[PDB]
Symmetry: C6
């Protein structure tokens, strides 16, 4: 990665085995649970497209997913080559070339070319652009790998309400709805899908009750 | 974070530490001090990273979102944004402090600017307020229900008592004031008699020494 | 904490998650065994009163004890306010205020005010003063939490003497006697409380025998 | 390694990391990317250290030696050594790149010299070529033999399929081209019918969504 | 410690390391070299920290106190303190080296002063002398009692033999001199005959090769 | 150890508890398996003779071996004193003495004297010289501790060929033959010692077949 710490200077450094090992373990244990993505984002801060490839490529298993993730990266590379066509010309001595889709994705560029683009002024953040493509790819996978439809999350007859809500908002997180639409499934589905005893208690509350108020209500 | 030595990337060890604490301890009161100590010098981005890498307890994390919205709203009411002075940068809105609508660059901007605009420490304050509500919610038993068993060591009973109290968060005036009242009333019969016999102004040392024997 | 390492300069740094995790584990495992206190002292070298509060406040459980520890800190704060009364006056531009009991204890001061006092010349070591109060508090707890009275430590009829001595001096450590009074319980209690066979052997040694000599003697 | 900040000793943590990965994973394809990432800026000495601290898989490590010999021979054929210019150092032979006949001093010499002679990165290339052969060898089942079971989730079947393929190393043209052919032909009957019914231009998403239901 | 790079606080990892070694290994001889290596550049405060964070083995730690007192007494006898030169600091008494009556400031003073007064390394010497006594004490079996079993591999027997010897601390002249004598006399009958048949000037290699077969 | 990292400067540093703990564990677990030696070499890069002694001396157990290793170090010290006789003379102010066998081995020198020799120009690499002696010593032990003779490694009747080869070349590694003589035991012993079914397949290959080709051949 590249972050500014060598005094005032901003020097490149080798991806940390601890960062790698961290990312591989999270993927092994958690299997594209939604929280994996924020973890990916946080382990890959200031990551070069090489670094990103290292993290993705050291995942053994979930290869179905990693293939899907390749397909997505290709789609976002194609769309980039359509939007930014390279005007083929000999490189002026003081400049470097414009990066193609495949160059951002780290497939056709060198670490030198990648450090070039990111540390150039104005910046060409090939790291952060490729990251954007990957994350878009993971989101699709997370939505895919979410086991149950939100419709199917129903509070059991003996199940604590706090447990039911915990599943409900977990499911929702995976089946990625914007936190406007998550806040709007609150006063609708969550109630409709509660068990009979606790549904009655939640209807009796009236509208516009907070999540605190609903969970306090069904505590028994 | 932003650290004064000789910005830095949030440490995988810090993340892993915070995620584990949340996994194991489940909004036990001691979680919050841990949050505060793992998030020293944290940018609002960093804070979001820590909160967002918690899988599970999503009920709670939703509640914590609701609280952050309330503290953002109250900020936009108190500071309504009205043209950028050449040497300065823009004024941060509720959503900008909370890291939702700002960049890491804008956040580093505000904290390292003179005079300082500590968007890190302000958002932290909002989060902690949010966790407190959750901790109070997740506390299993009411202080009223903590009663010393007939064979239960007094030291064990007090340990539950003041744990419960910590969760059902009471001011250190009201914690000090439940001592000479409830703790005694809720002790077992043998040890209650011993604690009444002590008279009023008795320390916790003196009470626990007293009921060591029974 | 603050220790001098940024070249010759002496810079403040964030309390290390590893230091915290270390201290919390020791408290979890060892439960105010005497060795906990030296560990506390060694994990809190150069600690600001904020840092100290962090370490104490991240202990969940032993809350009975942590309440007791609060009571003690209040007693040492009161005694400080009696000894150093603040003369209410507007702060001269080049100075800072005098710290009250509650300011040392980190309850009413900021990290800025704390760094102020410690790095000021002459030094006002609010870190080291609060530490002194805490440790006094833990000592009381350790003495409290010591399970058996030294009187009750008696060598069993089949128990190796080296085992008996190990309990004996452990108990003594908890029931904190000065290492003059620990050295003086040697040639008295330790012998009186040994089993019959080995007591006879230890009396036969005469006075002024070392611990080595006594333990060599009762090897059988 | 040789690292640009503000030579260094190979980190016990790097060594321990690499040895464990080889112990646990046994030339699974993902081992190689891990090798590449643990050996960033590695001197040919460092590389030998990593390979030589692998106990066991000695069959493989012998094979890996044979390959390194082949790439050393091919180098000595392409660059035959013919007197040392006052400002310069000698030209590296096959055996000198491979770290067998050079010193750490000579290796630091070549890499930090201008123009750079990246003996680290050249030897790495030879090793990786060697591991690829071993990975292809150690892959247990032929892609032909990966068939979706009658009760096996399609997501599970695809996961084996593309794992196998990874080992039996195929170009990302030939990986993309086994998709719309073998993967379908080797699916179970119920899900094959569903995948044929999709028509030709179907993504992996679309295929896996399709067979989620069955 | 005091470390020359480009005082520092004793590392929690150093502490944790030392406490674990004492917990697990129980004054096995190898503990002492470990003590010496974890306490490189240690101030007398640091040393006290390491010794004082050992819970348990308190019998031993008391003995170790007695020894430190003996080496402090012997120091006060050899250096009796007799007015502070303007550029200098006071002369350290037995109790000042042992860290009991000095401050960290006074200790950093003595070690970083010119000429150097290595209070760290002097106290260390006293401690190690103390541990040696304990190790010799805690050694379970007398070298006389180490005898090769009738079915026991010779390599196993020698491993006990030289372990025992290490504890019952013998000079490397007396260790080298118990070789061609006791080790043979205490071998089992079959292998003793083989070792006598070797003649006198035989290495440990030669003896262990000889009894590999039986 | 001493490696050049304090900017351009080359400063001595304390042997890392993690390095020690690493080396002790490897010796505990692996018991002079051949791979131990490369590990020793890699944990002891830039090691002073003191450091080396620390690593060797913190091995508890395998004391038989550590005694043998002492005997070897003495033999290489004697041979050094024969080759470099010290001419007894008063030390010229700008110089230091010539190191004796026992001085290299760290037994009779100080850390100061050792840092002296290594950082002197031209260098006197007492670290790297003692290391050479140790490694020679470990090789003898590894060859000793190798359980079976290469002659005795025979492919079982049901044993996968890849398993048999893995033992074969492991054994060989211990019974240290040069990788010319390891490459020459390939087309001879490995075949002669294969099981009947797979021997026939390997003879049928002709001479000069690679290890790949042989292992591909006996895959069934
Ligand atoms: Na709420
Ligand atoms: Na409350
Ligand atoms: Na081969
Ligand atoms: Na292939
Ligand atoms: Na003694
Ligand atoms: Na002895």
């Amino acid at each position: 990665p590249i972050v500014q710490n060598l005094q005032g200077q901003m020097v490149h450094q080798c991806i940390s085995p601890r960062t790698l090992n961290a990312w591989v373990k999270v993927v092994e244990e958690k299997a594209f649970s939604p929280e994996v993505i924020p973890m990916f984002s946080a382990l890959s801060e200031g990551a070069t497209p090489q670094d990103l490839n290292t993290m993705l490529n050291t995942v053994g298993g979930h290869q179905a997913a990693m293939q899907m993730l390749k397909e997505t990266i290709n789609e976002e590379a194609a769309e980039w080559d359509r939007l930014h066509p390279v005007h083929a010309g000999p490189i002026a001595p003081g400049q470097m070339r414009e990066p193609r889709g495949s160059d951002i994705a780290g497939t056709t560029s060198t670490l030198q070319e990648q450090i070039g683009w990111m540390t150039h002024n104005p910046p060409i953040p090939v790291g952060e652009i490729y990251k954007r493509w990957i994350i878009l790819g993971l989101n699709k996978i997370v939505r895919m790998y979410s086991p149950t439809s939100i419709l199917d999350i129903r509070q059991g007859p003996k199940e604590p309400f706090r447990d039911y809500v915990d599943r409900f908002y977990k499911t929702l997180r995976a089946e990625q709805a914007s936190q406007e639409v998550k806040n709007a499934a609150t006063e609708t589905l969550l109630v409709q899908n509660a068990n009979p005893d606790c549904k009655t208690i939640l209807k009796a509350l009236g509208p516009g009750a907070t999540l605190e108020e609903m969970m306090t209500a069904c505590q028994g």
